């Protein structure tokens, strides 16, 4: 019937403070309105001047702050009908206040099958910390701990290779500066 839109962040969903971010929404051709919803409230609207000629919209933030970090969804209009919301976009503002320390247990590079547990400290932060594997399969691993958080990996494998980074958080969407790589 009315296809579900796709929302994404350019360059990436991890936007350091006062950096530019463009949220893109791909709806359908001949759609009259395109809405960006921020944390359950209308944030922005794009009305494609030639509507039949357009299937996508660009929303851009010029200076990224904490005030605009959070959950984004996209919705578009055809007549008086509204498409069901797009996937959720979690816009995270990085480089907020401090740099956390990233230690590794037992060592920086080890023999396979060894139990590896990454550690990340930063007082003056929340109990939530994030572990990130740079590049190839850039997934985020969430960790809990007062002042120091434990990121167990267990028996290491060849995929467990890579340069890792740690972020502390001031809320789920406002993370600290990245920690020195491992």
């Amino acid at each position, epitope marked *: 019937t009315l296809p579900k839109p796709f929302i994404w962040a350019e360059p990436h969903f991890m936007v350091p*403070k*006062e950096k530019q971010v463009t949220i893109c929404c791909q709806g359908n051709y001949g759609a009259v309105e395109y809405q960006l919803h921020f944390e359950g409230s209308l944030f922005a609207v794009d009305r494609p001047k030639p509507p039949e000629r357009i299937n996508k919209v660009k929303f851009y933030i010029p*200076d990224m*702050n*904490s*005030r605009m970090a959070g959950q984004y969804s996209c919705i578009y209009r055809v007549g008086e009908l509204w498409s069901e919301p797009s996937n959720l976009l979690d816009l995270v*503002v990085t*480089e*907020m*206040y*401090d*740099t956390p320390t990233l230690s590794v247990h037992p060592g920086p590079e080890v023999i396979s099958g060894e139990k590896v547990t990454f550690y990340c400290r930063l007082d*003056t932060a929340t109990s939530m910390f994030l572990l990130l594997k740079e590049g190839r399969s850039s997934h985020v691993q969430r960790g809990y701990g007062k002042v120091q958080a434990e990121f167990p990996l267990g028996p290491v494998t060849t995929a467990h290779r890579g340069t890792y980074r740690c972020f502390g958080s*001031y*809320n789920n969407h*406002a993370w*600290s*500066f990245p920690s020195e790589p491992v």
Partner: antibody
Amino acid sequence: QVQLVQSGAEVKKPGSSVKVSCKASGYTFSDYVINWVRQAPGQGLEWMGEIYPGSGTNYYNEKFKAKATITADKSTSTAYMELSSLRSEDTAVYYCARRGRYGLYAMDYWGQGTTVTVSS
Amino acid sequence: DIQMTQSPSSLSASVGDRVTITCRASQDISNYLNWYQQKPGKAPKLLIYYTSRLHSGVPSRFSGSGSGTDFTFTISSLQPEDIATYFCQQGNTRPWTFGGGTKVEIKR
């Protein structure tokens, strides 16, 4: 661009309290820690405390924990320092300095100072 | 509360001279050291952050070296404007502490 405008200098009769302000502009106030640094004649630079504006989280120097009251007002984008029970000894130049540009705890941008004078 | 000891209190050098300020911490502060230039009347300006890093605007001639407890600030070739009181500060543990400050003058 980035500015830190402080309130006018004051004469304070001993016993009185002072509220010195620091209005932030050219940046989003809440994404930068506001520090309050004192400079008594000869005593050099002494760090009094700091506020994380975004969550109102405070960190004081025990020495100044007594009379200093660091508060941040997101709604006006101004950081305040209240100095209660003013003693002659407290007469100094008061600075406000931001601390988030490099997550390495450096005061990149400083206010102009407020020359507070405790005197009868 | 880490104690920063700056040296010398003051120094006078001719224009185009290499100037070296010393800074010592009571505890190992890693590289969490900053340097400020304070001109007469004005507020301190950030010169060097994280021991060796140059803040946006600060000229090439300024530099910083060190690790642990022993740290130094250098000017490659002293300029008449570089006349000010320099301060080092630690950012390792709270409270942030500053060095007593070392003044700089120009011999002419």
